[PDB]
Amino acid sequence: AHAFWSTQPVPQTEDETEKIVFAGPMDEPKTVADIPEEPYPIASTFEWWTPNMEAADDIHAIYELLRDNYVEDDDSMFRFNYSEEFLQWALCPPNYIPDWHVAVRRKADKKLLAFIAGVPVTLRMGTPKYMKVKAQEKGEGEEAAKYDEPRHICEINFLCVHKQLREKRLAPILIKEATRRVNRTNVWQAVYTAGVLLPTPYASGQYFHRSLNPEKLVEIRFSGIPAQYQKFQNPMAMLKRNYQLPSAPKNSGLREMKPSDVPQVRRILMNYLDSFDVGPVFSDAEISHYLLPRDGVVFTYVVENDKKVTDFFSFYRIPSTVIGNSNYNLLNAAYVHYYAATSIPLHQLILDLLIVAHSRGFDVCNMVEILDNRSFVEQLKFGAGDGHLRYYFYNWAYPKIKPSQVALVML
């Protein structure tokens, strides 16, 4: 029973999605001229506001809203606390559209009540490999390949309704208004992810985490000894020994990424991502934006062997407010971003990610099982978390795929 999602151009059930064999649009074709010029109606007490996400004070306003009202874990222990610097980075990539950053404020006092954001991305989202094999068998190759060209679409993130205004049907209004503004830019698809199940994901993956500071983690999450360590005489010493890391990177030639690295990083990353059914395509400007180091935000290291970049990894920072535990304000988490390995095993490359993160004072490394992230889970002592990340498209029929066929990292 979905009063809003039943009206939208998405597959309505798992059963429906399991039937889809080719990529393509769901809705009637439309043009920009069909789409309302006026913002979607909202109660008189409210007003639409388009923040300027390159302006410090507007960034700070959105920052506070998310700090206090964004995504929590399921047990009221953590709330994401994306930083102001991070929001500017994530929301203002090359060729971003300011109008796609959508807020609602109370008109009387200008209190910020809600937000949703779209950003442009170029995405490969053609029929997946396994369904093209089927299509070929059935003599339907061209129909399966029709939508292979990378598509200039919208990624939606940062949907947030203030906690005081929950369960008032505000979220559907925010979605409708974002949709209208994106459609008015001649864009007709979106990709989005969520921790909740909605109609209807094309892929779903567990979260995995790797403790870097177990004494802090075990104290917050338990807030004493985890069950399987209860058998040791000295559980904390065992925990610390289990998660200990080198104090400096092992790969000779590791260094932070440089602007002159951009084109080589672009080539090795694109060659790698092209192996996945769903993944982004980045220009040099986008590689520069999403991967060059930005203090407190994104950290990227390359393996350089004789002036050649042969491998790289990146991670980004999202602290979470420790909303349950009294002893700590924040948990400093490093999330695995894009990477590519051509000279060393992936586990050896990502060991250095763990070492740098640890050395820079992060408490935990988190990721979803997209890309080849499962290839280093066991070797590097990641464990499954309680979350899942579900991947969705708006106005795009798409067959179920495995999370290891997804190459899009969402921030």
Ligand X SMILES: CC(C)Cc1ccc2ncccc2c1NS(=O)(=O)c1ccc(CCCCC2CCN(C)CC2)cc1
Q: Output the known binding site.
A: 2-5, 159, 161, 165-167, 169-171, 193
Return the residue of 77, 92, 97, 194 that touches ligand MYA, per CB under 6 A.
Answer: 194
User: Strands 279-280, 112-124: parallel, antiparallel or unpaired by DSSP?
Assistant: antiparallel
- Interacting residues toward ligand X by CB under 6 A: 71, 73, 78, 80, 157, 193-195, 207, 209, 217, 221, 320, 331, 333, 364, 366, 385-387, 389, 410-411
Q: State in angstroms the smallest separation of the CB of 85 from ligand X.
A: 17
Q: State in angstroms the smallest separation of the CB of 46 from ligand MYA.
A: 13
C-alpha pair distances (Å), 365 with each of 5, 20, 126, 208 = 34, 35, 32, 8
Return the residue of 25, 93, 150, 172 that touches ligand MYA, per CB under 6 A.
Answer: 172
Closest CB to ligand MYA among residues 173, 380: 173
Angle at Cα 329 formed by Cα 323 and Cα 333, nearest 5°? 90
CB 376 within 8 A of CB 347: yes
Check binding of 323 to ligand MYA (CB under 6 A). no
Return the residue of 81, 88, 189, 310 that touches ligand MYA, per CB under 6 A.
Answer: 189
Check binding of 300 to ligand MYA (CB under 6 A). no
Site string for ligand MYA, 148-167 (x = CB under 6 A): ------x-xxxxxx----xx
Closest CB to ligand MYA among residues 163, 231: 163
Check binding of 395 to ligand MYA (CB under 6 A). yes
CB 343 within 8 A of CB 313: no
Q: State in angstroms the smallest separation of the CB of 73 from ligand MYA.
A: 11
* Residue at token pair 């640890």: 358
Q: Which stretch binds ligand MYA (CB under 6 A): 84-92, 168-176, 280-288, 356-364?
A: 168-176
Return the residue of 71, 92, 225, 292 that touches ligand MYA, per CB under 6 A.
Answer: 71
Return the residue of 81, 88, 179, 211 that touches ligand MYA, per CB under 6 A.
Answer: 179
Check binding of 170 to ligand MYA (CB under 6 A). yes
CA-closest candidate to residue 372, choices 410, 339, 325, 342: 339
Q: Which two tokens stand for residue 296?
A: 């407190």
* Residue 73 binds which of ligand MYA, ligand X, none (CB < 5-8 A, kind-dependent): ligand X
Q: State in angstroms the smallest separation of the CB of 70 from ligand X.
A: 8
Indicate which residues carry an active-site annotation.
Answer: 411
* Residue 331 binds which of ligand X, ligand MYA, none (CB < 5-8 A, kind-dependent): ligand X
* Residue 386 binds which of ligand MYA, ligand X, none (CB < 5-8 A, kind-dependent): ligand X
- Binding site membership for tetradecanoyl-CoA: which residues? 2-5, 159, 161, 166-167, 169-171
- The residue ranges that bind ligand MYA (CB under 6 A) are 2-5, 69-71, 154, 156-161, 166-172, 175, 178-179, 182-183, 187-190, 192, 194, 196, 198, 394-395
